Amino acid sequence: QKWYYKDPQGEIQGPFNNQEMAEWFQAGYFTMSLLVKRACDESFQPLGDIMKMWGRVPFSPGP
């Protein structure tokens, strides 16, 4: 549940929780090229690749 992303300079920001990531995503700060991962993930992935592979990003909330 520990999210990281790379900023435009390549610096790794985080960890952030699901709610913080979801808020920033809904506010529009993230393009689908933003590179994200949790500590437990294999590699950074752009949000768009996560969407193409899973149909959703894990931090998106819902029922």
Partner: peptide, 9 residues
């Protein structure tokens, strides 16, 4: 609400 560290909006 703060912006994401390393991003500005």
């Amino acid at each position: 609400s703060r912006p994401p560290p390393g991003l500005t909006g």
